[PDB]
């Protein structure tokens, strides 16, 4: 049933084929069961952590590992009748290390919850049927629902389908739609047609919608849609979309992956090509395995070589410091990379009920008559303060603040506002906080009556709970309800009938008091009260309150508005007809006008202050959402969206407007409007979606479930701490004490932690390049090892991984924040930064050689033929008499190597040091400054020497402890580095740019 709300009641039984008094026969039920299936939201399981562990395999760069591991297992188990007791640990060691960095991966990506598990509890899992078969409604399970079943809900009901209303039993339907609009406000429904074919949600007066939830009244209806047909199903299907997303971030280090692979890929061709340009003289004796494992070994070294293994510790660290002190702020990350996010975000889409606002609604002005004299009409107008439901707050008149109780007028007004109530309010004591009971406009009644405090009642000593309703219970003490004329569409209002306390049935006094829309209720008025008497409505009194009632309706005040009366004489019980409610607007007349209350739900305090700092950051703020235009505008202008007089004619949007636009005209809608009202779900990833495809860095900020899909969609969702489990669990952190402003601070941490980490991948990136350079220069210049696998993954991952993890240490830039973001195109490392790192790596990759190279020759440790016959390190018993004079196993020696890794470490230190700047010379910016970087110079060197001399060490990695002259020389290649950087830093901070 497509469309049931643009059709009659009739049409739409006809449509099905069903009595709305005796409903489906049960073969009905079979085939709409077989043709439409059940009724329920399908489970999204979300992939078990083996899945997950073998996707993180799914890249080349661990590919590329996975590989290697196997071919130094191939190696690991062909080993020579020598190092037989640990050639596996090559292999080992690797493939460990691809456990461990893919657990981490998919550890810091984490959580058990569900949006969909979250969302599938508003499923109720009963709802009440007519039947065929049964005359009385059956109680059958939700799932068991079928489109067109007769279905009937009541009072707190849970709407187990999407359902045309048929009748209402009631006087009215009030009903709860939060899960698709974020307002908690009753709608009153009615059995119209709304032929709009294109009307939204909010428009849609005549059906209820599955999930939400029945606040008052009694109705049937038609089931139109069930399952995944419905509003809450579509809401499902967004919530579904797991199109693997990363942050921009990722996607960065992603793109930077698949570089350093064809890389890899492009170095073993030609580290394949000036071999296959000396395979033309192998003097062929001794297999071609020789030269077979040549490559797959080098091939095993060039990769290990280049791979920065060891980033993910570091960067996850990193993230990992960062989301603990977003901790400290309240801000819960639930994905380590998003700690990142905000950083580089440049919209921030938000809700704003509950979220911008507090979501109480509260009364802020007030009126009652001051003064009437023929064409003269004064009235007392009263601020209230507070914001929330607490009955904390304040009454002025001028800001001057003022006692309620003596002006009689605030004592009527009070007294309406505590009778003519169905609500109340209450101490939650576990979360210490007040909390309506029943309606926000009705709550908003109670606290008001608390805060005037009209009787000077004492409440100073009363606990909190006690507190709750001290003042209203003072009121009701005074006047007994008899009962309520409840609330009818035809007349726009309520009231209350009352006896005075201690009277007899049949006595004087009886009163009712109204409230309700401004217009019906003053044309019901034939009196004005002033103070303690009353005096006849007329013409300009009329237009006096007419016009601050306007006045207040229409600022960036907008408030709700609602009249407050009483009738002086009502009619006696007897003669009123309370099963009949079209009575009631006669039975509310001759009234007596009292006064006006002004409600809005406000913004919380520190938004307006976020958007400006945001904006300061070059951070567009854009409001979504469900409520009404007039409310979404004056509140954009309370919080900075939108100057408090700037015009918005092309600036704000309904749902309905938006809809009516062309794509091409709805795509820039989102560029250049700031306010989107009355929208529905799929309105608010639709506007994201639109800003994305602009490359935007997209943020969604909310709190309902109506946020789910945009917060899913957008790069980042931040949910409020007090909303929902579906909006917290479809985020990636969560304000859980609410506070907007940790929205900026988490901005500032995501570009502190986009700058450490471009200083540690610089830096790390940078030994990796010196790697390479080295297993390149011991290869075409067929040379003895100079640094071997097991070597490069305890640099890599420990003494190169200390310090990077320390660089994060820095106290973040003075001007982070006043900046407008990267740009999404604007790549990790470039430019100058690139030449900068490669300058490092070369003068690493010649330095190590070298080391080696040199005890080799001028070394009296190992004196080798000392004009470069170095080279041939292949006849060695095969030419043992030729270029000889000495032994033959002396390429093998742990020395060469031992001066190769010292200067690939003693490099890397001092690199540690340059690293601490970009640009700013260590002479400018001293190298003590920070110390757990020296700390972990000290952990990482002191490392070095434990594979120097703790026993069993130097033989895994073959090393031998060196000679003092030894390391002055290691020291004598490696401190160099420092003028090196130094070269390109006086060259940065001048003749560049500055
Ligand atoms: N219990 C009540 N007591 C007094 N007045 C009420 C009561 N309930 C509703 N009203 C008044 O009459 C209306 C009730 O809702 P209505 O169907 O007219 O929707 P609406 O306010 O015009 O907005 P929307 O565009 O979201 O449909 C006013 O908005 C409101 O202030
Ligand atoms: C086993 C496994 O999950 C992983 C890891 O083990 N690693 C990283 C990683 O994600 C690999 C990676 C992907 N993209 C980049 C960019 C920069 C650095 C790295 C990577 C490290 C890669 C490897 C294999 C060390
Ligand atoms: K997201
Ligand atoms: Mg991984
Ligand atoms: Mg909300």
Not at 770 to 796: D, S, Y
Request: with cysteine; hydrophobic share 40%.
């Amino acid at each position: 049933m497509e469309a049931a709300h643009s059709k009659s009641t009739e049409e739409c039984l006809a449509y099905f084929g069903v009595s709305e008094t005796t409903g489906l026969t049960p073969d009905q039920v079979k085939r709409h069961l077989e043709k439409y299936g059940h009724n329920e939201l399908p489970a999204e399981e979300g992939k078990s952590l083996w899945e997950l562990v073998i996707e993180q395999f799914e890249d080349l760069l661990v590919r590329i590992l996975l590989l290697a591991a196997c071919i130094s297992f191939v190696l690991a188990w062909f080993e020579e009748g020598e190092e037989t007791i640990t050639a596996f640990v090559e292999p080992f060691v690797i493939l460990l290390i691809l456990i461990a960095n893919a657990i981490v991966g998919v550890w810091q990506e984490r959580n058990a919850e569900n949006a969909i598990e979250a969302l599938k509890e508003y499923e109720p899992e009963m709802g009440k049927v007519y039947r065929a078969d049964r005359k009385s409604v059956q109680r059958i399970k939700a799932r068991d629902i079928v489109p067109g079943d007769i279905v009937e809900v009541a009072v707190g009901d849970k709407v187990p389908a999407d359902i045309r209303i048929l009748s209402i039993k009631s006087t009215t339907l009030r009903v709860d739609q939060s899960i698709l609009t974020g307002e908690s406000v009753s709608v009153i429904k009615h059995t119209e047609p709304v032929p709009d074919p294109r009307a939204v949600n909010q428009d849609k007066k005549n059906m209820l919608f599955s999930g939400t939830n029945i606040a008052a009244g009694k109705a049937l209806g038609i089931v139109a849609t069930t399952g995944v047909s419905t509003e809450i199903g579509k809401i499902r299907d967004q919530m579904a979309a797991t199109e693997q997303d990363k942050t921009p971030l990722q996607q960065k280090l992603d793109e930077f992956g698949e570089q350093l692979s064809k890389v890899i890929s492009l170095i073993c061709v030609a580290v394949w090509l000036i071999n296959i340009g000396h395979f033309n003289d192998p003097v062929h004796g001794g297999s071609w395995i020789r030269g077979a494992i040549y490559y797959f070994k080098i091939a095993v070294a060039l990769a290990v070589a280049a791979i920065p293994e060891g980033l993910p510790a570091v960067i996850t660290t990193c993230l990992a410091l960062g989301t603990r002190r977003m901790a400290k702020k309240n801000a819960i990350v639930r994905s380590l990379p998003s700690v990142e996010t905000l950083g580089c975000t440049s919209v921030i889409c938000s809700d704003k009920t509950g979220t911008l606002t507090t979501n109480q609604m509260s009364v802020c002005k007030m009126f009652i008559i001051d003064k009437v004299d023929g064409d003269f009409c004064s009235l007392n107008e009263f601020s209230i303060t507070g914001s929330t439901y607490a009955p904390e707050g304040e009454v002025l008149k001028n800001d001057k603040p003022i006692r309620s109780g003596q002006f009689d007028g605030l004592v009527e007004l009070a007294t309406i506002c505590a009778l003519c109530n169905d609500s109340s309010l209450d101490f939650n004591e576990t979360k210490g906080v007040y909390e309506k009971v029943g309606e926000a406009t009705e709550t908003a009644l109670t606290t008001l009556v608390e805060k005037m405090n009209v009787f000077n009642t004492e409440v100073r000593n009363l606990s909190k709970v006690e507190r709750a309703n001290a003042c209203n219970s003072v009121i009701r003490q005074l006047m007994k309800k008899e009962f309520t004329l409840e609330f009818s569409r035809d007349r726009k209002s309520m009231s209350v009938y009352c006896s005075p306390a201690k009277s007899s049935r049949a006595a004087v006094g009886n009163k009712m008091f109204v409230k309700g829309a401004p217009e019906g209720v003053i044309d019901r008025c034939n009196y004005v009260r002033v103070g303690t008497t009353r005096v006849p409505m007329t013409g300009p009194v009329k237009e006096k309150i007419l016009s601050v009632i306007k006045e207040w309706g229409t600022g960036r005040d907008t408030l709700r508005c609602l009249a407050l009366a009483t009738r002086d004489t009502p009619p006696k019980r007897e003669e009123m007809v309370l099963d009949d409610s079209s009575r009631f607007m006669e039975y509310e007349t001759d009234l007596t006008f009292v006064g006006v209350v002004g409600m809005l739900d406000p913004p919380r305090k520190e938004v307006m202050g976020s958007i400006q700092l945001c904006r300061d950051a070059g951070i567009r703020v854009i409001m979504i959402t469900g409520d009404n235009k007039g409310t979404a505008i004056a509140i954009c202008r309370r919080i900075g969206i939108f100057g408090e007089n700037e015009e918005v004619a092309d600036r704000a949007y309904t749902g309905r407007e938006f809809d009516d636009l062309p794509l091409a005209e709805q795509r820039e809608a989102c560029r250049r409007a700031c306010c989107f009202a009355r929208v529905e779900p799929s309105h608010k990833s639709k506007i994201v979606e639109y800003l994305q495809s602009y490359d935007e860095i997209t943020a969604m900020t909310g709190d309902g479930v109506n946020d789910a899909p945009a917060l899913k969609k957008a790069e980042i969702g931040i949910a409020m701490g007090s909303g929902t489990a579906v909006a917290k669990t479809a985020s990636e952190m969560v304000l859980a004490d609410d506070n907007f402003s940790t929205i900026v601070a988490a901005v500032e941490e995501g570009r502190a932690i986009y700058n450490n980490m471009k200083q540690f991948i610089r830096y790390l990136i940078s030994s990796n390049v010196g790697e390479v350079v080295c297993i390149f220069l011991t290869a075409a210049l067929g040379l003895p090892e100079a640094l071997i696998p097991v070597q490069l993954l305890w640099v890599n991952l420990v003494t190169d991984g200390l310090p990077a993890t320390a660089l994060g240490f820095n106290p973040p830039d003075l001007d982070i924040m006043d900046r407008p973001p990267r740009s999404p195109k604007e790549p990790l490392i470039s430019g100058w930064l690139f030449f900068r790192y490669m300058a490092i790596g070369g003068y690493v990759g010649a330095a190590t050689v070298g080391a080696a190279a040199w005890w080799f020759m001028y070394a009296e440790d190992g004196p080798g033929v000392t004009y470069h016959q170095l080279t041939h390190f292949m006849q060695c018993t095969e030419d043992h008499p030729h270029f000889e004079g000495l032994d033959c196993e002396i390429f093998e020696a742990p020395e060469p190597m031992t001066m190769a890794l010292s200067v690939l470490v003693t490099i890397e230190m001092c690199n540690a040091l340059n690293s601490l700047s970009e640009n700013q010379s260590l002479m400018r910016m001293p190298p003590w400054v920070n110390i757990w970087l020296l700390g972990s110079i000290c952990l990482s060197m002191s490392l070095h020497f434990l594979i120097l001399y703790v026993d069993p060490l130097p033989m895994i990695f073959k090393l031998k402890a060196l000679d003092l002259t030894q390391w002055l020389m290691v020291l004598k290649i490696s401190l160099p580095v420092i003028g090196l950087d130094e070269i390109l830093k006086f060259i940065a901070r001048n003749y560049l740019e500055g």
